[PDB]
C-alpha cells in the first residue's frame, strides 16, 4: 500500500518502548488513539481504520501509537504500564520533535471509543500541544453518575481490569478532573477545534470495541455537545446520525470526512 515507519518510542513513565505508525507528511501531525480492544503491536487505525490510505498525500504527518488497550489513554494512579497522558502529552510530542523535525504544538488528536475521550482530553488540558480534537463514538463524559459505573463495568468485563486503580474510587471525586465535559470552558475559551461523531443508536458490531457500553458513549456525545454550547463553544463540527455503527464499518470512513477539517485546522 504505502511504507510507514515502524518506531519504537522510549516511554520513560512507562518502563518501555512503544510501537508508533509513523507517516511523515509536514511538521504538524494527527495523533490516532484506538478503540478499548486495542492492537498490541499495531494500532486498528492502520488495519481496520485505513488510516495511511485516507490520510496520505494532504501535508500531515500520521502518528498511531499501539499497545493501549483498556487504558482510558489517562495517567493510571496504580499503573506505571498506563502512563498516557504523559506518553502523549510530553514524551512523544517532545521524541518527534527532536529526532523527526515535527513542530512541538499545534497537531490533532483523533479517536474512536477510548480514544475519543483520550482526544478530547489532550485537547483540553494541553492546548499547547493540540489544536484539534477529534470523537468517534466517544467517552467524553466518563465522570456522569451512570457512565462511571458503566465504564467500571465493561472495563473488568473486556479488560480484566479495575478502574479504582485508574483515577481512583469515583466517590473520590477525581473522575470529573480528567473530564472534558466538566472542563468543557476549557475547549471552548482556547478556541481547539472540536469534531464530534457519534450515531443515536447503541449498535456495536464489536462489543469490546465499546466495552458493551455504546449507550453510554452515545449520550456523553450528546451531552458534550449540550455542554459545549453552553459555555460558549463555537468552533465545533456535530453530527448525529440515526443510522452507524459503533465501530470500524463507520469509523473508517468517517475519517475521510473529516480530514479535510484536520489539515484545515493544523496545517
Same mark, same amino acid.
Given at each position: 500500500?504505502?511504507?510507514?515507519?515502524?518506531? !519504537?518510542?522510549?516511554?520513560?513513565?512507562?518502563?518501555?518502548?512503544?510501537?508508533?505508525?509513523?507517516? /511523515?507528511?509536514?511538521?504538524?501531525?494527527?495523533?490516532?488513539?484506538?478503540?478499548?480492544?486495542?492492537?498490541?503491536?499495531?494500532?486498528?487505525?492502520?488495519?481496520?481504520?485505513?488510516?495511511? %490510505?485516507?490520510?496520505?498525500?494532504?501535508?500531515?504527518?500520521?502518528?498511531?501509537?499501539?499497545?493501549?488497550?483498556?487504558?482510558?489513554?489517562? %495517567?493510571?494512579?496504580?499503573?506505571?504500564?498506563?502512563?498516557?497522558?504523559?506518553?502523549?502529552?510530553?514524551?512523544?510530542?517532545?521524541?518527534? /520533535?527532536?529526532?523527526?523535525?515535527?513542530?512541538?504544538?499545534?497537531?490533532?488528536?483523533?479517536?474512536?471509543?477510548?480514544?475519543?475521550?483520550?482526544? !478530547?482530553?489532550?485537547?483540553?488540558?494541553?492546548?499547547?500541544?493540540?489544536?484539534?480534537?477529534?470523537?468517534?463514538?466517544?467517552?467524553?463524559?466518563?465522570?456522569?453518575?451512570?457512565?462511571?459505573?458503566?465504564?467500571?463495568?465493561?472495563?473488568?468485563?473486556?479488560?480484566?481490569?479495575?478502574?479504582?486503580?485508574?483515577?481512583?474510587?469515583?466517590?473520590?471525586? +477525581?473522575?470529573?478532573?480528567?473530564?472534558?465535559?466538566?472542563?468543557?470552558?476549557?475547549?471552548?475559551?482556547? %478556541?481547539? +477545534?472540536?469534531?464530534?461523531?457519534?450515531?443515536?443508536?447503541?449498535?456495536?458490531?464489536?462489543? /469490546?470495541? !465499546?466495552?458493551?457500553?455504546?449507550?453510554?458513549? !452515545?449520550?456523553?456525545?450528546?451531552?458534550?455537545?449540550?455542554?459545549?454550547?453552553?459555555?460558549?463553544?463555537? %468552533?465545533?463540527?456535530?453530527?448525529?446520525?440515526?443510522?452507524?455503527?459503533?465501530?470500524?464499518?463507520?469509523?473508517?470512513?468517517?475519517?475521510?470526512?473529516?480530514?479535510?477539517?484536520?489539515?484545515?485546522?493544523?496545517?
Amino acid at each position: 500500500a504505502a511504507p510507514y515507519e515502524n518506531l !519504537m518510542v522510549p516511554s520513560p513513565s512507562m518502563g518501555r518502548d512503544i510501537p508508533v505508525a509513523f507517516l /511523515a507528511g509536514g511538521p504538524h501531525a494527527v495523533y490516532l488513539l484506538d478503540a478499548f480492544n486495542a492492537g498490541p503491536d499495531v494500532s486498528n487505525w492502520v488495519t481496520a481504520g485505513n488510516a495511511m %490510505n485516507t490520510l496520505a498525500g494532504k501535508g500531515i504527518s500520521v502518528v498511531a501509537p499501539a499497545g493501549g488497550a483498556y487504558s482510558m489513554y489517562t %495517567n493510571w494512579e496504580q499503573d506505571g504500564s498506563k502512563q498516557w497522558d504523559t506518553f502523549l502529552s510530553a514524551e512523544l510530542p517532545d521524541w518527534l /520533535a527532536a529526532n523527526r523535525g515535527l513542530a512541538p504544538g499545534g497537531h490533532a488528536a483523533v479517536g474512536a471509543a477510548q480514544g475519543g475521550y483520550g482526544a !478530547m482530553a489532550l485537547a483540553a488540558f494541553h492546548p499547547d500541544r493540540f489544536g484539534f480534537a477529534g470523537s468517534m463514538s466517544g467517552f467524553l463524559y466518563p465522570s456522569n453518575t451512570t457512565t462511571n459505573g458503566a465504564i467500571a463495568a465493561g472495563m473488568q468485563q473486556f479488560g480484566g481490569v479495575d478502574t479504582n486503580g485508574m483515577w481512583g474510587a469515583p466517590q473520590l471525586g +477525581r473522575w470529573k478532573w480528567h473530564d472534558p465535559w466538566v472542563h468543557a470552558s476549557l475547549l471552548a475559551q482556547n %478556541n481547539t +477545534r472540536v469534531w464530534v461523531w457519534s450515531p443515536t443508536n447503541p449498535g456495536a458490531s464489536d462489543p /469490546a470495541a !465499546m466495552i458493551g457500553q455504546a449507550a453510554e458513549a !452515545m449520550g456523553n456525545s450528546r451531552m458534550f455537545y449540550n455542554q459545549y454550547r453552553s459555555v460558549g463553544g463555537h %468552533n465545533g463540527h456535530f453530527d448525529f446520525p440515526a443510522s452507524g455503527d459503533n465501530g470500524w464499518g463507520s469509523w473508517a470512513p468517517q475519517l475521510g470526512a473529516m480530514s479535510g477539517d484536520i489539515v484545515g485546522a493544523i496545517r
